[PDB]
Subunit: 135 residues, 14 copies
Amino acid sequence: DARKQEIIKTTEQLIEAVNNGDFEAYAKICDPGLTSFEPEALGNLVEGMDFHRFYFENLLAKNSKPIHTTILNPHVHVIGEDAACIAYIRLTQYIDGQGRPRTSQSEETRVWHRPDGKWQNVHFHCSGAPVAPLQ
Amino acid sequence: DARKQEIIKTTEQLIEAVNNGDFEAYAKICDPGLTSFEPEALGNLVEGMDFHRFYFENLLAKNSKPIHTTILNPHVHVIGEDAACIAYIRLTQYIDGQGRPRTSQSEETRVWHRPDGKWQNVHFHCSGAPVAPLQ
Amino acid sequence: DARKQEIIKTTEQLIEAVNNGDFEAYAKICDPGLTSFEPEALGNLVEGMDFHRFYFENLLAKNSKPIHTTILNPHVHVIGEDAACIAYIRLTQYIDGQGRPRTSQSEETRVWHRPDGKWQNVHFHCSGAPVAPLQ
Amino acid sequence: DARKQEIIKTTEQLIEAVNNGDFEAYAKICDPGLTSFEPEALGNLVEGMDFHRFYFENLLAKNSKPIHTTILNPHVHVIGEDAACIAYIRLTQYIDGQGRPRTSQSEETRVWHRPDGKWQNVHFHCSGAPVAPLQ
Amino acid sequence: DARKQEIIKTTEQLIEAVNNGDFEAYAKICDPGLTSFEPEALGNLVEGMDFHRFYFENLLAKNSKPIHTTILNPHVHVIGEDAACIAYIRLTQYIDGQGRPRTSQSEETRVWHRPDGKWQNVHFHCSGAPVAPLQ
Amino acid sequence: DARKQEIIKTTEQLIEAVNNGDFEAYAKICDPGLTSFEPEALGNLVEGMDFHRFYFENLLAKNSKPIHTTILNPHVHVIGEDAACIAYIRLTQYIDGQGRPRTSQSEETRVWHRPDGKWQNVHFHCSGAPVAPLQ
Amino acid sequence: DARKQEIIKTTEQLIEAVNNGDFEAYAKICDPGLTSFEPEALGNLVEGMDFHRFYFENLLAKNSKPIHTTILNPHVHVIGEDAACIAYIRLTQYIDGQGRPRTSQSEETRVWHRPDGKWQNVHFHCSGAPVAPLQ
Amino acid sequence: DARKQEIIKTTEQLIEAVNNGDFEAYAKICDPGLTSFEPEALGNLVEGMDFHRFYFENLLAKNSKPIHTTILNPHVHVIGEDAACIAYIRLTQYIDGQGRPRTSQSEETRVWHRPDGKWQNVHFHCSGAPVAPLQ
Amino acid sequence: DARKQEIIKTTEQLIEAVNNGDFEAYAKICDPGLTSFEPEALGNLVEGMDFHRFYFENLLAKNSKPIHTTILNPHVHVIGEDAACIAYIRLTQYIDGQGRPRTSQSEETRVWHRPDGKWQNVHFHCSGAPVAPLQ
Amino acid sequence: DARKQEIIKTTEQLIEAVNNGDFEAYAKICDPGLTSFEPEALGNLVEGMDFHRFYFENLLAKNSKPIHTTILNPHVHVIGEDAACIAYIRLTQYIDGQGRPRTSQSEETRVWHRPDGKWQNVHFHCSGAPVAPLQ
Amino acid sequence: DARKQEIIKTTEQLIEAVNNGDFEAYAKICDPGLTSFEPEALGNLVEGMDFHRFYFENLLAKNSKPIHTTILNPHVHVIGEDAACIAYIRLTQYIDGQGRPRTSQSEETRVWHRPDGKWQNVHFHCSGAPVAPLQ
Amino acid sequence: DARKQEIIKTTEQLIEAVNNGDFEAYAKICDPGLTSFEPEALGNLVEGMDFHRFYFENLLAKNSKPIHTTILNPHVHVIGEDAACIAYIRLTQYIDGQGRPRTSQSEETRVWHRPDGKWQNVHFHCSGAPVAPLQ
Amino acid sequence: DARKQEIIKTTEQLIEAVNNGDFEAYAKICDPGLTSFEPEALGNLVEGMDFHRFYFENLLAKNSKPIHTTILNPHVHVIGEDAACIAYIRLTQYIDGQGRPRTSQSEETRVWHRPDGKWQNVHFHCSGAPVAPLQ
Amino acid sequence: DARKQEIIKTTEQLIEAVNNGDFEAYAKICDPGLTSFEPEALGNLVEGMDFHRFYFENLLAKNSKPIHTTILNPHVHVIGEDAACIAYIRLTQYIDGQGRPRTSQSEETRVWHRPDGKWQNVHFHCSGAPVAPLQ
């Protein structure tokens, strides 16, 4: 019961740092050796922070229109005291370049480790919609 | 060094059970609560074994043509003594319905847990090519 | 006779609160645990009010052009004293971005429950046209 | 707890009578005044059994290939002692006219009433895939 | 009440004579000066029986596969003792040239007159699907 | 001879009230229970005046360009002293958004009843061109 | 009255000689200097019988499937005692190469002269469908 | 010889009244019961002057750019003292909306009668290009 | 009068030698220095007989189906006693590979010279349809 | 030798009068009974000067951009003392509506007669490019 | 005069060795260091005989259907006593895979040198049609 | 060795005169009887200077943007003391109408003769890209 | 001079082992750590022999039709006594599935090292055509 | 270990000189005889610096928007003391002409030689994306 709810809590804090363009908070949540699969990387496994830094600097820190995000049907696996995995469906509501409301879907997996009494993200996999909305 | 190589060993034993259509060996490797994201499930999170059983019975146990599989650039995260995560690129070589050799690519993540001294799979995510080849 | 007409009355009061962008009246008509199937949710079952709040804030409270709505062939099922179901065809007449009159169709089911002597909506299903008109 | 599980039980017994082409069992589960929205009815509300009887006689009682069905994320509303509503996502796995395995999705709502101590279906709404698979 | 039901009765007897290819029964129901608008006449008003006789002789008397017909939402206007008008939606279920079940829709108006104590059809208008199904 | 000419007279007075956008004259010609089939209603039977009121308010009372209308080959059925039916082809000549003259065709049926010594319209069916011209 | 009916009589006798492939009867009805506009002549004015003789020899005398023809709304101009003109719409019902019934339309003008007490055709113009049906 | 040349003379005077937009001269040349087949009438036979009056008022009396017309290969049939028929190919040269010279073709039949010592047109048939040029 | 008719006579004798595949008669009609423009020569001026000999040997001497040819509106220029030019429209009626009758058009110019008291062809130009029909 | 060069001389003087828009010089070179085949006449044989006068007045006398013309491979037939024929390929270089240089090709035949000691053109045939360039 | 005709003679002997598939005669005509530009070499300069040997062995020595070749407008440059260049247009007539006669065009340049008293080919360039006909 | 390098030297001096629009230098390099095959001449052999003069006057003397040219793999044949042939691949780098750098390819053959102690060009053949770049 | 020719010799021996399907000779030429870029590997760097073994077993050892290969413009870099690099264009001539001769192009780089007195291949890069021909 | 890291160091210094448009630093890193395969050269092997100089002058020295580059999975072969080869995947992140972030991929091989104690590049091969981004 209580152990699964803190993995939901850290996952929601991560997603809001990305919404705000808050790269300084986002960098505290990630392990420096973090790896990623996502639609922007063209089928390659990316490692470290500098691929994501470009989207913070050239996009996410600049934009300011309303967005709403929903997490659907989260499933949590707990792998002892120091490791967890979460999988969920993500729906995004956003405003397009004509001012009309639109919707998109992605499927996401996140893997969490507990060094030094702090939860940090070690691997991420994303399917479906790109992170940049087609406004 | 030695701990990462046994996660490669169990991952290669899993992939060959699927190639052989060996559902009885495959069922020993999986946790009964296993969850999955894959191209056949249309963006839904599937749970348990019975969605996969259909592909064993109606396809993988029947087919017999030559296939070759390559694992490229595997990255392993070790999360204490009892948990691990592996991510890799998979290339498949197969023969089409005209008899011509063809190639396809997928991106895969697998999450492993160590109950009772035996490694078992708890979550899987797949991107790119479907598991049924377009022969 | 008289019991079916008050289910038509609450259904017509609901549709007009949406036409007016009156989120404060709409929130009194809905159970807090309300679930929905609709074309905007991409085949997912949505729960609660916050998915709909976005369309009130970014669209329905802002727009002001003439719209007319017709309810065709309503069928009512009465399931004791405290529960009812209504199903109907909905035609919408609206003005497009060039100023021309246009028409669209949807099929709708609504499920009603009577806690505390007040009728409240518990589930909704929609087919056909989206709620945002293609002006 | 226990009351929601018998609404899942009757819903699973209904779906299997349709899979088997068992019109005599299906006719005991339905109220004679049953209404329906579905993709085959071209946006019209159908009433009674004779629209469905045609698919039993000309299709479902004749076919015999393997099919598998999954119910995802069922949500149940209980509306006193004698009424209930269930909503879920349905995945179908089937074999096509070339012998290849395929998958399709629908969204379904079912409304249940308890006359004479027996649960019977009074209204049904379906979205997404047709009931006849595109083999 | 009772007067509207005999206009439904004659309308259902007319439609079944066409289903059976029974030109001798159909010719007793029609006034010899009958006029028609229908999709086969290319936007022209047809008069008399000989345009319809061709579809009896070359098609409707020859075919023998299962068909089912539904009349939806019939509205009846009664214009004294000797005249009536009926309007309705018609759904047809039929088997195609591959043996698959299919559905089509038309909108129909029929005008009835009561010479010599017998109801006879004087004008007909049809919209939507052709009378020959696209098998 | 003389009885058919007054059904042509009322039909021509109806069409000119629509050309002028004169909803107050049009409302005197129609029975309050009037039903309609037309291309704007998407295959549904409409009842009463309020579906048509929208086209008077948002279009027909606003527009002012030249239009010419021709009634071709009218056929009249007389069904005693108090009822009649008329069927005809309608050609419309109008000016488009570039200022060029254009032509369109429809097929129309109108049913007339004589309550209180005044002819009133009880049912209407239209095929072919929409009532809003594609300027 | 009676003079217009014999121009309808000769026009119906002409059309049936073409249906039968009876070139010997057709040649008695035509003036030897007859001229023609028709879709087969590619926008050229043809003169005499030998252009039409080819369709008798290579087609109309060989074919034997059922055809039905309707003359709609014939208008007759009478130009003294010895000359007349007739204009009408022609509908053809025929069976295609798959055995299905089909319909086509043409517009026709015929000019008649009365040498030697016998009516003969001097000019013909045709629009719309070709004389060879697209079976 | 001389009788055919006055039918060419009246035909050339008719075509120039249309070029000039001179409806008052055109109305003296036509019989009040004149009938027409032409591309603008959508396959219908038109009667009288008011269909043509619209093209005089909204187009032919307004336009003023250069046009040239050629009559090719005129064939004349003379049907006693009081009736004639003429058939010909018509080529039109005109300037488009970009200022470029363009060409179009039609095929025309005209039927002439001699009441009261004045030649008047009783029927007209046109094929090929519309009378409104595609500038 | 009489001089133009012998240029029509030699032109008709030439066209029939080509229809028959009679290269020995065709070679007597042509000057050995004959030049040609035609659709088969891809925009090049051909000289002599050997380009045409290939169509006699590989096509025109082998084929045997019915063909009919019409010469329309021939214009003849006479350039003294020993030279003439003829220009005309040619219509061909032929049977296609399915057995259906078809029509095609060409425009032709022929230049004639009178050495040794015999008319011979010195130049030819063709536009429109190819000489090989698209059967 | 010398006789062929004066037919080249008159042909080059004709082409330059058309380039200059010099209708008064062009009219001295042509016989009043001149006939023509060309791409602008839609497959019809034109006679006289007035079809060409329109292109002088509305185009060739107005335009002023650079054009260059080449005559390739001219072949001359000499038919006594008073008649000649010339055939050649014509290449035109011109500037388009964007200012870019472009090229087009035509095939041309010209027939010359020598009345009154002056060479005049009696017939012309053109294939390939139109005379109006697609600028 | 006489020197240009022997360059035409060797060029015609070369083309016939290729038509016959006579690689042994063709190899005597070519310098061993011969270079080529042609459509089969994909924009590359080829050197020597072995690229051409493949078309002799796998095609030109096997085929046996009728072909005819024309050389148009040959231009010869003579560069002293021992060197020449020839340029010409080539038309090929051939029979396709359905048995129909077809035509194609190429542009060709050939460079000739006179070692040891024998003319031999040193360079070749080809444009337009491929050497393998599209049968 | 040294003799091949002066044929490269004259070829590079020719290409730069064209780049500069220097028609006066270009005219000294060419024989007055020069012939050409190139993409602008539509498959015709051109002779002399005036076809090329148009591209100097209307284009090459006007333009001024940066261009770079590369000669790849030049092959030289030497045909005594007074004649040579050169063949090469040409790559052009240029700036388009949006300011972006682009690349194109051609294949070129040039034939050189040595009258009066000066090398002059006698024939040219070009394949691939046009000389006017698609900016 | 002599050192570059033995790198051409080993490169030609490698290409012929692949043509013959001689995997046992091919395996002696390659370093066991060999890496590859090629069109079949979908943009991935492959390592070792087993990716290539599949094309030997399922294709190259089975096929037997004629193929010819040309190496164009080879450039060799020599990097001391024990290392070399070669780059070239490769043209392949082959017979398709209809028996027609076809051509394809690739660009290739090969890197050679001299361990133990034997030249072995350490890296390969390929662009353009796939190694499996599109027969 | 240490020897492979200085080949990564020189490769990263090369890529940054190109990013900066620093042709003077780039020219010190390259051997004057450098050869290249790349997408801009249309399948040709380029030699020397002047093909690349054009992209420095007309593009890379002018542009100034943000770009980020990643080197993935570099593999290094060491071929004695004085020669090395490196192969890698390159990902580029850039801003398009609308200001949106975009990604592209290439595959690259570089060959390094150590004359005079300084590493210099001797050959380069590139596949996938062009070096000019499609902004």
